[PDB]
Amino acid sequence: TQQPIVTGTSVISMKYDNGVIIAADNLGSYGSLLRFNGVERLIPVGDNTVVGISGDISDMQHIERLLKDLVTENAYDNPLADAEEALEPSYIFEYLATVMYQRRSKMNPLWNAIIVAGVQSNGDQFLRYVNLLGVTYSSPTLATGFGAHMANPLLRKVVDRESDIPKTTVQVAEEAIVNAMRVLYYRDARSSRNFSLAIIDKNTGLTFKKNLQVENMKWDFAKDIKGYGTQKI
Amino acid sequence: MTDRYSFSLTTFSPSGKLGQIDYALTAVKQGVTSLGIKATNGVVIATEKKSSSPLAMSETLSKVSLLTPDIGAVYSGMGPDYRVLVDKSRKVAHTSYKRIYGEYPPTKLLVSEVAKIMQEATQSG
């Protein structure tokens, strides 16, 4: 049993017709202090998977190393490591889920909430969540922390059920994700303007975008707001 | 200070009269005429706007007053006494009825409450 120290906020994601999108800001908070501003919380595994992590950053760095070691280990005595016997998103997720549930069962959890986004061998989209309790679930949209409360409602307007996935394009899905990140910047006190976004497509592969910023923000209306009720000046 | 008049100012005289009430009725007699007529599908109340000066804006002085959405009042006698009775009548309709039953009081019960206030000014210290 511990408590999280340096933390990362929301991770948001959604499925679209040819793949998945996942995003997360670049902040490492130390309570109310916005301590670290250059933290990457999306970690690619090969060219078909991206693991997005929230919660304790020290535990994230530990998971990051487990995944790096998983790639090394899979290549051992494996001539098809870059082909048929390469790591799949489902393999990577089940491994993490096994680790998370084992750690909670020893009362020494990895204080995280994880989303594994990727595309399988057969082109199927993969999107599943796992957390410090070993709890797992899948949905067309997935988000952690504040993203669950604010991002999912916006992303579910695009993909409300399974049948909406083929009707959703990558431009629409990316637009929705970027809008959601702006909303979280408006309303989450532990968020930052700077973020990373990753797209895993079954045709165009893995596109990893860094140093993105929230833009097109509305603040002008603030000038007209005066006092808290009766004040006019 | 302190209100040291804790005794009645209205008392029975040897003949059984309550002087201050009789004298109050005499003040009402000197007052401007007001009337009320009940119809089958309504009631009307009326009075004269006796303006004290032509420079005065008599629209600002309301002799006929709304007590509830379905109850109105008019008077004859001393205007200031009426004004404060209307204030109390409006309030008692809320405190002793609407805040309890969620609806406005019936005419007879609001009248009963106003009457009680006027009776107490006839016996209290």
């Binding site: 549930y101 909670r104 309790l133 709890v135 949905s139 | -």
Partner: protein, 222 residues
């Protein structure tokens, strides 16, 4: 302090027929007031004509099911591909649950299938391993809403024959699979109205001598 347990909501229902059995459950997964998934399967085909659902804390439920599926696999290896009877599976599950008497699987588990005489069977478990064979059992969030309705409409409790005035009970006539599915759908539609954790979808697994069939029905998403 770290709390190793959680509540993922959900509600399940098992009914045993004369020569069939059903195990139903909603597909909504939740934490507190948020929805995690509108479709997260909760009732599983475990092989050997046995269906299972571990309702409560999803992490423990997935672990138990995963372990039981594994126990079926090793039963075949160890005993010459013998079919695991429903009564044998029930007893096995008791021992899986009691292996954690002091750090329990936070789930109420139900299995369904056919007994060795071909009749419908449902077995019901508590988190620590007490189990018993039953005819009707609702488990989970809205269990208290559903079970009284099943006592009334399946076992005809408090129902008497008109004219006798309480002297003669209503006779316990057997129900068809179509009749049972109606009671299941109405149970979940009523639960969905009055319980916030119930909704989104309903998945039913029907077990007969022919095998395991699935049926899905939408529920309100509010």
């Amino acid at each position: 302090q770290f709390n190793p347990y959680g509540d993922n909501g959900g509600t399940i229902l098992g009914i045993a027929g004369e020569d069939f059995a059903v195990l139903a459950g909603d597909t909504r997964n939740i934490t507190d007031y948020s929805i995690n998934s509108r479709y997260e399967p909760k009732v599983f085909d475990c092989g050997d004509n046995i269906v299972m659902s571990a309702n409560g804390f999803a992490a423990d439920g997935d672990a138990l099911v995963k372990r039981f599926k594994n126990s079926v696999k090793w039963y075949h290896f160890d005993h010459n591909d013998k079919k695991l009877s429903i009564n044998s599976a029930a007893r096995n599950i008791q021992h899986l649950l009691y292996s954690r008497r002091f750090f329990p699987y936070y789930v109420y588990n139900i299995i369904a299938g056919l007994d060795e005489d071909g009749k419908g069977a449902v077995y019901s478990f508590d988190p620590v391993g007490s189990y018993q064979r039953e005819q009707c059992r609702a488990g989970g969030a809205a269990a208290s809403l559903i079970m009284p309705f099943l006592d009334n409409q399946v076992n005809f409790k408090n129902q008497y024959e008109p004219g006798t005035n309480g002297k003669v009970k209503k006779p316990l006539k057997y129900l068809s699979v179509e009749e049972v599915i109606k009671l299941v759908r109405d149970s979940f539609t009523s639960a969905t109205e009055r319980h916030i954790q119930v909704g989104d979808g309903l998945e039913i697994l029907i077990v007969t001598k022919d095998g395991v069939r699935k049926e899905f029905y939408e529920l309100k998403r509010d």
